[PDB]
Ligand binder design. Structure first.
Ligand SMILES: NCc1ccncc1
Ligand SMILES: NCc1ccncc1
Ligand SMILES: NCc1ccncc1
Ligand SMILES: NCc1ccncc1
Lengths: 133, 133
């Protein structure tokens, strides 16, 4: 009934079906939702997580095309804070214990990952068309 | 004002930003539109055009996530006929002379391609992180 504001974040490098189904699942947590999507910066992703193929600007321009995405914060903060939830009027964080405070506040919503659909999995399928010998 | 029905078709293998921007451009040809997207079958694509990484079912499930896509015909016919336009009440075909009859009927609408954003271009960018020697 009342509109519920959902927040999900990530790298979204080389956007594939796995990200899409995750975002859809976040978007449909409730009947009436606004899904805000946060895109991690190149520097912090590279320092804290690992290598990223596409720049922040490219990764954001691709997310803009996904039907479930209502709003994008680019770049997003690397750590979600309670002050971040308050300023953007976020009701729930959708993710796939650093996150214990979100669970304690009733604001953690799980979303599953789909294995086997990644961009790299597809390139693996390309290479398997070449018998080793 | 009046709702205009747009049709675009293609393989949409390994969906990337290039396809997305093309679909957006088709969707925004007019103020009020319904964008129908046709997805070529595996057999006909492989026989007439060339190799396709993802099956028809996978290529369609990914397009379903694109915000501009209103309706999908999967599989679509390989050749667009006037009887196809009539049955689906298509007003315009958006594409990037086999298509001379569409131009003659006022139903051909061009959409441009974006070079440099393909899935394969990104894998090229990955491989360039490895100095040859
Ligand atoms: N992709 C992991 C991550 C998500 C949110 N903030 C930082 C890192
Ligand atoms: N669309 C947000 C953005 C714009 C320019 N650079 C990076 C991100
Ligand atoms: N991708 C080329 C094509 C588009 C429509 N029908 C057949 C082939
Ligand atoms: N979504 C249409 C479709 C379903 C099953 N196989 C291929 C295409």
């Amino acid at each position: 009934s009342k509109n519920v504001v959902i927040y999900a974040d990530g790298v979204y490098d080389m956007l594939h079906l796995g990200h899409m189904k995750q975002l859809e699942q976040a978007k449909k947590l409730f009947e009436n939702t606004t899904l805000i999507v946060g895109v991690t910066s190149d520097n912090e992703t590279k320092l804290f997580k690992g290598q990223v193929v596409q720049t922040l600007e490219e990764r954001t321009e691709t997310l803009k095309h996904i039907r479930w995405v209502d709003e994008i914060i680019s770049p997003c903060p690397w750590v979600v804070t309670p002050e971040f939830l308050e300023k953007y009027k976020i009701d729930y964080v959708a993710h796939d214990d650093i996150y214990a405070w979100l669970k304690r506040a009733g604001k953690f919503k799980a979303t599953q990952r789909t294995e086997g659909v990644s961009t790299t999995d597809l390139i693996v399928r390309i290479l398997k068309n070449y018998e080793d010998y």
